[PDB]
Write a protein that binds this ligand. Structure first.
Ligand SMILES: [Zn+2]
Ligand SMILES: [Zn+2]
Ligand SMILES: [Zn+2]
Ligand SMILES: [Zn+2]
Ligand SMILES: [Zn+2]
Ligand SMILES: [Zn+2]
Lengths: 425, 425, 425
């Protein structure tokens, strides 16, 4: 059922307010399915038929199904996605006290659209690092309830509001979380300490640092007269993580299947744990002999880089090429850009397109208007052929994005077919 | 003879309208010379004196001559160039039907100069991926004849034409290829199917995707009162591919010689097969033992990165530094930029400059005016010392560029000397 | 069929790089067909059925075919065209010596589109006036070989090239023709002396002055998927000179036919040499008695003023009126402009429109958009009724223009019908 898949997506989104939580949610499903967690510090002893996963920074995840045939001779079938989404992150000395409020200073992470973050019931989640019994450790928190808001200024006090103004992030985006009594101090670290106790039963000696993201408490939901759509934060790109996961868990065949979901894509993938890092490469090498084996394996592999595409928006149709306007619910989009903003080529495109035909999934094509500006990055790190595809969406980088409610099922089906395909060379 | 070299260049350019064709043309000369093609999927068994080449994506080529002394102890002598040039590529849903014409929608690939593409007799070539007997495959096509034109608008309907306007690529660059009868449909994929039959005797079940570049049907030619010049598309950087090839095929000595010609340079080299990919590195490692051997070899190696330079243009001389204006026919230019836009340093510069002196080839120096903005990329991928050099040219990224007709011979001679040089450390 | 007419057009364009050469090429054809050259200094003795031509400045030509009925009683059937085209012409003290090159200073003749002149393999042709054996004389030269180039500046040194800039003709248009040795003197007049020896076996005492045009060495060619098009320099207006000639030479009937091809149309006419000089009037008067004859004859005459029109361009279709967008290969266009930018009227239009219908040639209508800005000149000299017609083309005043490959035949057919037409309005 599309309906079961879509509900599964809504659940996953709800459990995944930050890249740490997305990674943990992926890990829980994998383990329930029998996948064994490996640690990058240990020597591994994997084998044919094994089901494994590994993480790095608790925010990037690689899932591995080793097939019957070795990667050396049959290659890997890889699906790539990303765990991060543009949002607001709490600063390290964040307490702002003004006009009787307590606010938290925020950085903008990734290319967020600012306006939609206003007038939303926000909570806060992510990683907290602390010392307990002279031991340094980390946990995830999620306050869950709506503790914050970034309100708009009344139109009465900003009469040209609808003219547009340059929203200044330093000044306009700090959320209000509380009011302070006369002479009441404010200690955010103390609030985190309370949350650690409440959520984990832990008392910290001291809260040191954290990576906390504001997020919307409004769950994702089906929308539309005929339930055509799905609305929710983080569709870019938890939509693809979830699809890629369902495809891996249900895939037939006995190929070598990889699900790589990396952090830091919204920011250029350049970290210890991003796609422009050697995470993927160092995991794959561990599944092969030394020498030429990795190079040979990779030239028999294909990466399907799954990241949301732009549907043609009816109130802004002129932002698309008239020949390449994807329809929501018209299936996955093959993304082409010969300037290598996407890595797709005629062979990767052709293979995917054929795969969609054999699976009876509709498929679409996108290029940008020629007067407008992980695929290329991972191709360039490990050298693997890549097709960039995505489900068509609107309002990418909003706090609440829109996709087609038929498209997840289309994508799970074709990814399932990819992962089961014994042929690529 | 300069004359034979220049004719060889004109032939090579004609056979090489796309990076796929350039790669194929290089491969045909190599094979005629006894070089054996290796496939990156196979285990290799190479040996001293062997002559090999390999390709990736059918658009990047590495040619290898293994010397008598091992690369571990004598290093590699590498010449780098690139197979791609700025141009117009057909979009994936390209048919535009308007005012009785059929046009093809185009992306701009690389930093093309738009104006010169107008009012030229264009053909179309590149890779087509298709299914024939339930098998997926690729071929090259080249329509050869002049089937397309991007006409200017009459000056009468654009009286300030000579004032300059911003040429909009989405709207102004689609070429006209035909006129359509009343109610005649247009299927580009069908035209490709016919071309596959005509050119290869193949009937496709279905044409899926393609990477097709428009190109100029006017051959390259000697020009000038005393035949001082050569004019042609793709001098950047088929000029260097060709030179590098002739130098490899004729080189004396018994050093380890590499010719690396990569795709996607005009776009940042960031692909499976570009210089910012691991193609080169993974090939070189296959020629050495495991362990420290590759690192040691590379620190005994030198990359001569050959890509066209800017001659000082007499109608725009103030775009050069007055002290660093290279003359066409004044020999190769050593390109310096301490901000690492070029990787040359005093040692790589000095070695090259000396090499030119011992070969009796004139040599020049270029830096940019200090108020203006593969070498650095490959140095940074494999860690190899690099000198960036180029033959001086005009009108780079036009459809028709200009070089000096004495300079190819100068460059072949010095590259020959580099490839035969037994000393670098 | 008339692949014949098109090949003849290509040959004529190739032999006619300047107005002087176009006039010579017209004359050689007319003589081959039996037409006798008269000289304007002599008294003429012409007669019924006579075939004559005359020139002025060696750059304007009038061909005369006298019918059986006198002009007085049956009028003249005139077709008008022009021998000149916008181009670049050598200055009288042209040598520019800079950064080791020799360039030639140029004037812009007519309303040339500058950009397309760049990055083209140019030769040089025209009239040289010199002294030999103490006497003054003129010959035409054509170097033929591609001796010159006006290169673009690299996009790397002009990074907003595609945004447009105002091309300065004084600075950016001088062609490079050579490189000079240190201390080597440049003498253009000496180069002309050598060309005179080489091409005519003449040695000059002194080369005095010249009128030389740069031109493109790439021949005109058929282009397009189904050979729909013809591309070439000088379609405006050698396309009409050629059509008129063919019609005159093949026309049936008995009428007095005139072909008038004048120089200097692209600059307003207004030389000794036409069309609002008195060349045409002074030749026509000499075919009639004194008195009221000329005036009477001219009121029974019609001038078909043939000069290229603008087809509707699909990448710039808003530059036409939506009701008046001529199609290439749609036949001759009747040009209408109430402000007398064209002299067409309801009677001259209707007659031409009827002629097309009876010849089974398709015919089109053009007016400009009412918000945007030769026939009128010659009607206003002489007083003759005039229909302004033209074949539809693109990119007019480029170095390489485009016409329909069917339209020349269409035009020759109707001009032949015009010339054989015994009555007019
Ligand atoms: Zn994304
Ligand atoms: Zn994103
Ligand atoms: Zn280059
Ligand atoms: Zn380039
Ligand atoms: Zn004209
Ligand atoms: Zn004109």
């Amino acid at each position: 059922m599309r309906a079961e898949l879509n509900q599964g997506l809504i659940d996953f989104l709800k459990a995944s307010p930050t890249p740490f939580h997305a990674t943990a949610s992926l890990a829980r499903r994998l383990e329930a399915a029998g996948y064994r967690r490996l640690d990058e510090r240990d020597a591994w002893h994997t084998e044919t038929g094994g089901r494994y996963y590994v993480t790095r920074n608790d925010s990037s995840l690689i899932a591995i199904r080793l097939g019957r045939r070795s990667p050396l001779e049959s290659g890997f079938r890889l699906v790539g996605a990303h765990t991060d989404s543009p949002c607001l992150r709490v600063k390290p000395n964040p307490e702002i006290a003004r006009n009787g409020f307590l606010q938290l200073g925020v950085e903008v992470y990734g290319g967020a659209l600012f306006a939609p973050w206003f007038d939303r019931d926000l909570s806060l989640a992510g990683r907290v690092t602390f010392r307990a019994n002279g031991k340094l450790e980390s946990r995830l928190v999620d306050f869950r309830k709506a503790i914050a808001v970034i309100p708009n200024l009344a139109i009465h006090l900003n009469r040209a509001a609808n003219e547009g103004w340059p929203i200044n992030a330093q000044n306009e985006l700090p959320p209000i979380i509380a009011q302070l009594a006369p002479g009441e101090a404010a200690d955010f670290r103390l609030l985190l300490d309370e949350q650690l106790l409440r959520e984990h039963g832990i008392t910290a000696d001291v809260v040191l640092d954290y990576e906390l993201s504001f997020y919307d408490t409004q769950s994702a939901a089906v929308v539309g007269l005929n339930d055509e759509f799905i609305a929710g934060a983080r569709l870019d790109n938890l939509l693809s993580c979830h699809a890629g996961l369902e495809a891996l868990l249900n895939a037939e065949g006995d190929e070598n299947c990889i699900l790589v979901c990396t952090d830091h894509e919204e920011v250029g993938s350049c970290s210890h744990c991003g796609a422009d890092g050697p995470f993927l490469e160092q995991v794959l090498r561990r599944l092969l002999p030394e020498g030429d084996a990795f190079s040979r394996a990779i030239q028999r592999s294909l990466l399907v880089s799954a990241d949301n595409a732009h549907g043609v928006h009816p109130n802004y149709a002129d932002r698309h090429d008239a020949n390449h306007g994807p329809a929501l619910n018209g299936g996955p989009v093959i993304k082409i850009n010969s300037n290598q903003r996407y890595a797709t080529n005629s062979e990767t495109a052709g293979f995917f397109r054929h795969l969609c035909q054999d699976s009876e999934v509709p498929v679409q094509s996108f290029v940008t208007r020629s007067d407008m500006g992980i695929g290329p990055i991972t191709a360039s790190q490990v050298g693997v052929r890549t097709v960039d595809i995505g489900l068509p969406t609107f309002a990418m980088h909003s706090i609440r994005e829109l996709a087609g409610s038929h498209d997840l099922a289309h994508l799970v089906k074709v990814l399932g077919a990819f992962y089961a395909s014994s042929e690529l060379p």
